[PDB]
Structure formats: C-alpha cells, structure tokens
Write a protein that binds this ligand. Sequence first.
Ligand SMILES: [Ca+2]
Ligand SMILES: [Ca+2]
Ligand SMILES: [Ca+2]
Ligand SMILES: [Ca+2]
Ligand SMILES: [Ca+2]
Lengths: 6, 405
Amino acid sequence: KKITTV
Amino acid sequence: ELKTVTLSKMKQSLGISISGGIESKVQPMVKIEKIFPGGAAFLSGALQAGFELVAVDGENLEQVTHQRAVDTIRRAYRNKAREPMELVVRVPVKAYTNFDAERDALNIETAIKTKGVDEVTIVNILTNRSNEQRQDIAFAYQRRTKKELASALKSALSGHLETVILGLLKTPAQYDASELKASMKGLGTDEDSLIEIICSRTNQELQEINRVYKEMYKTDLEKDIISDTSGDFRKLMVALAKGRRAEDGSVIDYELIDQDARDLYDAGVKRKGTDVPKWISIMTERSVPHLQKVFDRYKSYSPYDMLESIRKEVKGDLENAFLNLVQCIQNKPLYFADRLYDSMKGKGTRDKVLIRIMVSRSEVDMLKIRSEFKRKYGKSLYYYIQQDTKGDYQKALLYLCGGDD
Ligand SMILES: [Ca+2]
Ligand SMILES: [Ca+2]
Ligand SMILES: [Ca+2]
Ligand SMILES: [Ca+2]
Ligand SMILES: [Ca+2]
C-alpha cells in the first residue's frame, strides 16, 4: 500500500 | 531465491521505489515497486520489481516497518565510505531485456534524426547506461537501421561531446586499446597517455587489452610499444604491458618485503648512478600489496621516500613512468584524483585526459576517486568539472561522475 521513492 | 547484489553508490540516486512493511497486511515484506532509469539499481541490471528485500549493507530489511526500510536503505546509500553496496534479495529473465535495448536504440535514433540533433537525450541515455547495456543498445541500433551506432553518432555529434560519447560506446578493452594506438600515432609519442594506461591497468585488464589490440590492429601491443619507445623507458613499458605481475598472495612475505626495500635503496639512492633493471624487476614483478609494504619499509633505509628517490635518480620519460607507477601502486584512486585535478586546475582544460579518466573509471572506482578528490582538494570532483566545462559536454561528464560530494 505504501510506495516510497528512496 | 536468495541473492546478494553489489551496486555502486556513485549515482546520485539509487533509483527505486519500494513497497510493503510489517505495518501493512497487504504486503508484510518490503519489495521493489519500480526501478527508474538514471539510478544505481537500473545500472546493475540485476534487480527487478517484485524482488523481496532482505538485507542492505548487513542491516536487516525482513519484517520491518515501511519507514524503517526507507531510512535504512537511504542511510546505506548515502554512506559512501562503504563501496559497493550489498543488497540481499529474494526472488519469487534479464533485468535489461531485448525490449529495453530496442527502446533505448529507438530513442537514440529519434534524437539523432531530430532537426538540429537532440544531444540532451543522447547524453541522458548513454551516460546513464552500463557499458554492457551500451553494447546491447549498439546491437539493437544496427538491427533497426542497418547502420552502426558509432558511425551515426560520429556524424551527429562534434567537439568534446563527440569524444566522450564515442569513447563510452567501446568496451573497456576496446577503449584502452584504441587510446594506446592513438598515443603512438604520428611523429613522436603521447608518453603521458601511454604511461597512464600501462601503469594503472591490472593483469586482468591488460590480458584483455593485449588480445583486443591484436584483433583491432593485427599487430601485438608489445610490438607497437617496442617500435615507438626506446631505452629503459621501453623496457619498463614492455614489462608492465605483459600483465604478468604476481597475484596478491594470502601470506605476507616479510623477509622479501625487507630484501626488496634494501635492494631498491642499494640500487638507487645509496650509490652513484642507478641500477635501473633492479628497479624495473621489483616494481613490475611483485604484487601490489607487497609493493605497498616494500615502499613503507624503504623509508626505514632511505632518507627519501620512493617518489622523492625517483625524482633524484632518473629523468625524462623513465622518471615520469616510475612516478606514475608508484602512485598507482600506493593509491590508485588518489592517482586518478590528482590527474583529474591537474587536467582542470589551470588555464583551460586538458580535455583529453579529463575525458579518458571519466570514461575509463566511471564503472571501476569513481566513488573512491571522488572521495580522495574531495578529501584532498576540499570541494568535489563535480564542482571542478562544473567550473571547467560547459554545455552538454559538461552534463555528460557530470553523469559519469555520478553525483556531487
Ligand atoms: Ca542540437
Ligand atoms: Ca563529427
Ligand atoms: Ca609515434
Ligand atoms: Ca644513485
Ligand atoms: Ca581550468
């Protein structure tokens, strides 16, 4: 659900 | 399923988005959602969306919060002191497929055929693909146009940018072999370039250069060196170019470390004149870690260190070659950092040197070069390249640098 561009 | 992937941290961005964490019931495990072109992960060609992240630089990513994984990977990627980065992943095809190569080739063809030529796109793609990916792109380009990519880009580009891009298209051994051929072309010799390559390449690199040079030019590299050089400088270059240095051993030979240090002193500073063959044999045959220790032990016998001893004992091309060789043995990233600084520090730019180092070391040890450069000169390699170069040529070099420090 959580998507984060590192 | 479990796999350890090493990735350089030289690129400014890792170039991935992640998903999941134990605060999530839909995805308890953190996985890769997307890989972006332009980042480290894409360059590895070993990471695909869907891979289950397990560990990064020894820290654990299994059964952690989404924020824990984000911050842990970020902290690892920003820690440039540990190169490369180790990414332990769990699999459920190549990461860079035939379709990816065809897409890159299609976009380069578009850029070449655009009115005025779209150099930004050409640079954006090629300086952000690995050397292996560039070979795939050239293959796909020829299949779709029936023309060679290098020839099309030679016609579409000019100036220093052309030099960068055509250099990037060659394999490392092709690039070095072609630069060695160029150093020996015309009347006289570009000794600085011959010395840089021959003194810095490893046995494995030189094995492939020797093979590829013969294939490209139908003569052995050693024969062209013999034709173009003379004296003890020739003897040293021929010896180094064989790529037959002793391999690094698992046992440190302290007795030989001391005997070599004493022999270097007896051959040079201790006596009138110099026994140059003794210097050549010790500095070409012994392993690099052994010689690092020899040069430290040499300072116990000699009032001058090895580099200062060379300046006192020999001159001309021979002196230049020994100074370069000893730097390469002592600290090769610092050797290249210093050559980069020298190529930019004064009026204008020694673009030939700047380009060759950025092309040839981009995928070898650029982060260590950058670290040594920033420590010594106080500002980053990126900063110096920005002040000394401009335009799309500058942007290409900055992408090969990877990021600022
Ligand atoms: Ca243009
Ligand atoms: Ca041209
Ligand atoms: Ca010549
Ligand atoms: Ca002497
Ligand atoms: Ca300058």
